Amino acid sequence: LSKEKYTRYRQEQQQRIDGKSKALVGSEDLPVLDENTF
Amino acid sequence: TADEQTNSLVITADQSVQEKLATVIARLDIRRAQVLVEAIIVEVQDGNGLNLGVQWANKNVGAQQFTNTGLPIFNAAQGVADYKKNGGITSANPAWDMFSAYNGMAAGFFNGDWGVLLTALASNNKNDILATPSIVTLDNKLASFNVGQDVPVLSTVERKTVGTKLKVTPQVNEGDAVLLEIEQEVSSVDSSSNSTLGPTFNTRTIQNAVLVKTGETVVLGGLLDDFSKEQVSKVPLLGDIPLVGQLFRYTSTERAKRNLMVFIRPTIIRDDDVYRS
Amino acid sequence: GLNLGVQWANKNVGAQQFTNTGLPIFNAAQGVADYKKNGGITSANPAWDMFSAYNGMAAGFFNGDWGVLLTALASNNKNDILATPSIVTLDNKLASFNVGQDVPVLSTVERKTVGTKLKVTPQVNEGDAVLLEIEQEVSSVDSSSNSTLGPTFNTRTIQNAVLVKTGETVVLGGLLDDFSKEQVSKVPLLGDIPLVGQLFRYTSTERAKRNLMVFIRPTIIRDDDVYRS
Amino acid sequence: GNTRVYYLKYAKATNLVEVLTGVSEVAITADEQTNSLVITADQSVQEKLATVIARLDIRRAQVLVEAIIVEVQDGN
Amino acid sequence: GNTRVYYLKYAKATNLVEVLTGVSEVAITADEQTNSLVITADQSVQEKLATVIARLDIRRAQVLVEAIIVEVQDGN
């Protein structure tokens, strides 16, 4: 139950990092959660 | 009776009671476990507004004007005309404050006697937050961790701590798991919207009791909040023409998202050697 | 932080302007034009306060009738802190250590000590280890954001009981706080062109990090000879 | 032994003491530090309260509660 | 056993205790954490209160209540 919220939130952050396009100035992303958790 | 200085306990009683209380104390004197409690507060916000409108004013026929474009066609045409005759615009011109604060592309076009003014602004913002307050404490002992600022609030005033706060009372039961009574919040003074009654504060507060295994990261709560607004001001029949109709209407759109998650990872310290590592 | 934006204003076509660039194209063009005619700018010119406070490179370029104004500022800061309050006390006796300042706070007023504070009650049990009930904080008066209600204070407070072996350094707590903000104001279709689109938008970016750790090292003094050394 | 010290797991000793007190009302008192319960009584009462505590000490379930608030407004 | 611990399902132990108290008035007390009810009494009373609780522990119905407020005004 926690892993699917932790991952659905993590996969949403990773989508937002890929959703921003280079060649436009944008905010530098945070570190996205932790991969080794769970 | 007890000696609070040496931390020693004085029992006077029969040899029979002594040998029985000696076992009760030995049972009740045991070493108690420690819990490292990490909270993980992740929030991500974003939203994008778009407000564009076309206003055309014609001397011969009439004008279409939309306030909320940030400048109306009437006050702009009085400012542009004033700018042509005088070569500049004084601060006393009423159009000064209207042009001085404006955002986005305002593109005018004159075809014959027809004036046309296009205003377009697309705003986009993004916000991301991560907090990881952690605290070590003995089981059944209440620990609190405050990082923030202590601000006065009106009522005569009163002092209020506002910041990242974690207040947890662990209970280790037994072997693995734990019982965490969590009271935490991330709050901050709101710089905008000050008032004579006092400051406001943006608070995200979660308080619950939960039972978590000793190594595991689990979700305490969360909020997924999503909002979309729209407004159009149009000319009634013309604004509904499928494509051309965007010339008559003034659209202002907005969207927002907030995805908040709160996680908690306890860890039990049984002995020193694991609490060095 | 990084905030850069391009605004171009054209008499023939129109102008793109962004407030929050610190100067808009309209008020700047009125100031630059005023500067050319008079050779200088009086303090009464409304553009005075706008140019007098500005940070970063503002580079204008005129091509034909097109005015173009580029504002760019990249701010960066860094901060680092270390504190090591130490106190010696008998077990089961409460010791406190204050280094700071005692400030009045409104309520009629009241006195409040604000500084580096360490209040600990040790319990030595038994032989090695200890039981430390720690109440400590590092707090300071916030110079900015004064109010008629009173001063604020930046407080970092941690209070917990912990059981530590006699020689060991162990972590009491900590906070890792990380923040990233972004804002753009753009022309709706043009601002999304992958490369050229940065000419139409005004971007303001920000980031922050705070990594705080609190450690505690007890040491037991059994006899005098170890307490000389 | 006349007195036993029960180490509670999943129950809170102070809470348990109040509930126990009625059953006993034997002396029942709790240690809030170690979260242990101290019952002194006859060997007969001890074996009976040992089952009452074992029944009353059980692990309790957790509930994830999601609310969904959807609103939609429009007007022309 | 002299004392039984009843695990209530659909009833609230603190609520039940007050109702029970009159019937007993035997010691009835409740654990608000586990939502369990603790009755200590003779084997005869236990078997009688076991039926009273089973009757009083039942599942309770839910009601969806829609109100419809229609108003119409006009005037010329």
Curated annotation (Swiss-Prot), chains D, E:
| Highest taxon of the lineage | Bacteria
Localization annotation:
Cell outer membrane
Induction description: Silenced by the DNA-binding protein H-NS under standard growth conditions.
Query: For the region N3, what residue ranges are annotated?
Result: 1-57
Q: Which family does it belong to?
A: Belongs to the bacterial secretin family. GSP D subfamily.
Function comment: Involved in a type II secretion system (T2SS, formerly general secretion pathway, GSP) for the export of folded proteins across the outer membrane. This subunit would form the outer membrane channel.
Domain writeup? The N0, N1, N2 and N3 domains are periplasmic, while the secretin and S domains form a channel that is partially inserted in the outer membrane. The N1, N2 and N3 domains each form a periplasmic ring; the N0 domain was present but not resolved by electron microscopy. The secretin domain forms a double beta-barrel structure; the outer barrel has a diameter of about 110 Angstroms while the inner barrel forms the central gate with a small pore in the closed state.
Official protein name in the record? Putative secretin GspD
Residue span relative to the full protein: 266 to 361 of 650
